[PDB]
Amino acid sequence: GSSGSSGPNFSHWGPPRIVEIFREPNVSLGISIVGGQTVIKRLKNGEELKGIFIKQVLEDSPAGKTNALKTGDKILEVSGVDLQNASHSEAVEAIKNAGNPVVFIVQSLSSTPRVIP
């Protein structure tokens, strides 16, 4: 264990996923994000996450149709912009200032998507 590992099948985050989302006029991408911090106490030590995570995704949106993005996910990059350590606003501007199309690089935790009605 030259490095060590801690996590007996707990919140196992698989590999990243790239998805191209085309922004809409009247309506936005239809994606949201929670929290959003860029600076936190150093001494702090834990296993939690601070990165940007999908807050909520609409249905009548370009992101809700791709069925490749859902609330809870962890956005690591968008349109080729590192939003991991990016605050709530730092990430927002990225999605709004993402050179269309708007690519999304997140990682869906050990879970399963949903089917259409």
From Swiss-Prot:
Coiled coil segments of this chain: none
Free-text tissue specificity from the UniProt record: Expressed in renal tubules (at protein level). Expressed in bladder, testis, ovary, small intestine, colon, heart, skeletal muscle, pancreas and cerebellum in the brain.
Source organism superkingdom: Eukaryota
Compartments where located: Cell junction, Tight junction; Apical cell membrane; Cytoplasm, Perinuclear region
PDZ domain: residues covered: 18-110
Residue pairs linked by disulfide bridges in the UniProt entry: none
Subunit (UniProt): Forms a ternary complex with PALS1, CRB1 and CRB3. Component of a complex whose core is composed of ARHGAP17, AMOT, PALS1, INADL/PATJ and PARD3/PAR3. Forms a heterotrimeric complex composed of MMP5, LIN7B and PATJ; the N-terminal L27 domain of PALS1 interacts with the L27 domain of PATJ and the C-terminal L27 domain of PALS1 interacts with the L27 domain of LIN7B. Component of a complex composed of CRB3, PALS1 and PATJ. Interacts (via N-terminus) with PALS1/PALS (via PDZ domain).
Free-text function comment from the UniProt entry: Scaffolding protein that facilitates the localization of proteins to the cell membrane. Required for the correct formation of tight junctions and epithelial apico-basal polarity. Acts (via its L27 domain) as an apical connector and elongation factor for multistranded TJP1/ZO1 condensates that form a tight junction belt, thereby required for the formation of the tight junction-mediated cell barrier. Positively regulates epithelial cell microtubule elongation and cell migration, possibly via facilitating localization of PRKCI/aPKC and PAR3D/PAR3 at the leading edge of migrating cells.
Written domain comment of the UniProt record: The L27 domain (also called Maguk recruitment domain) is required for interaction with PALS1 and CRB3, and PALS1 localization to tight junctions.
Record-given protein name: InaD-like protein
Taxonomic lineage from the root: Eukaryota, Metazoa, Chordata, Craniata, Vertebrata
